[PDB]
Structure 1
């Protein structure tokens, strides 16, 4: 038993490792989207940079779980990071829809981890999730949903001018 360990259930330790893998998986999926929008036959630079930043943020989420695991006296166990579901992402609308579903999948895993932490009476883990993870998900899900609404308004997928304008006006100029 780690000398620091107190009120930290083995199930929660394991679930934190699984969550860590999912954060890394999400990072890798976003990195794939970045590379896609940087292709010369796609060429939406601000969209590409948006997904690059999304990828970097997921890696930070992963690293925070590693640090958490050690703070509680659990042990980080890594597994393969599975490649993303697609090799090409269609267009800005398809990619944003996939991002929305990814962020909701991550959110559900975090909510499930909160359920487990609650069941095991671990208020520190509950607070960690609430203070560091759950609001980030709600905020980003809202942001991405708002983007999707605007992409549809702009006539995606068919309206190329709409897609061009989204890249200029909706995402950060990079």
Structure 2
């Protein structure tokens, strides 16, 4: 047992490792979206940079879980980072839709981890999730939903002018 370990359940330690992997997976998906929008035959650079920024954000989320694991006396265990679901992302609307679903998947995993922490009576882990993850997640989901509403308003996927306008005025 680690000398620092106190009130930290094995199940929570394992779930933190799985959560870490999911954050890395989300980062990698966003990296893929960046590369797609940077293609010469897609060429929506502000959209590309939005996804690149999100990729970095998700990596930071993962690193914060590594730090957390060690602070509690748990042990970081890494697994493969699976490649993203798609190799190409269609257009701004399809990508934003995929991002919304990804964000909700990550959110569900965070909420499940919070429930586990609650069941194991771990208020430190609860606080960590509430203070560092859950609100940023709600904010991100709201921003992406707002974007989707606007992309539909702008006539996506068919309206190329609408897609151009979004890239130039929303991101």
TM-score (norm 1): 0.98
Q: Secondary structure at the match of 1:74?
A: coil
Per-residue Cα deviation, 1:50-91 (whole angstroms, up to 9, x for no partner): 000000000000000000000000000000000000000000
Task: Work out the CA distance in 2 between the residues paired with 1:14 and 1:122.
Answer: 14
CA displacement 1:10-69 (0-9 Å, x = unmatched) = 000000000000000000000000000000000000000000000000000000000000
Residue ranges of structure 1 left out of the alignment (5+ in a row): none
| TM superposition outliers: structure 1 runs of 4+ over 2 Å | none
- Alignment length (residue pairs): 171
2-side partners of 1:24 and 1:10: how far apart? 22
CA distance in 2, matches of 1:151, 1:78: 37
Show structure 2 runs of 5+ residues with no match: none
- Scaled by the length of structure 2, the TM-score of the pair is 1.00
Q: CA deviation at 1:103?
A: 0.3
State how far apart, in whole Å, the 2-side matches of 1:99 and 1:120 are: 31
Q: Which secondary structure state, in structure 2, belongs to the residue aligned with residue 56 of structure 1? A: helix
Cα deviation, residue 128, structure 1: 0.1
RMSD: 0.2
Task: Tell me how far apart the structure 2 counterparts of residues 140 and 46 of structure 1 sit (CA, whole Å).
Answer: 17
How many Å apart are 1:152 and its aligned residue? 0.2
Superposition deviation, residue 111 in structure 1: 0.1
Distance 2:97 2:140 in 1: 13
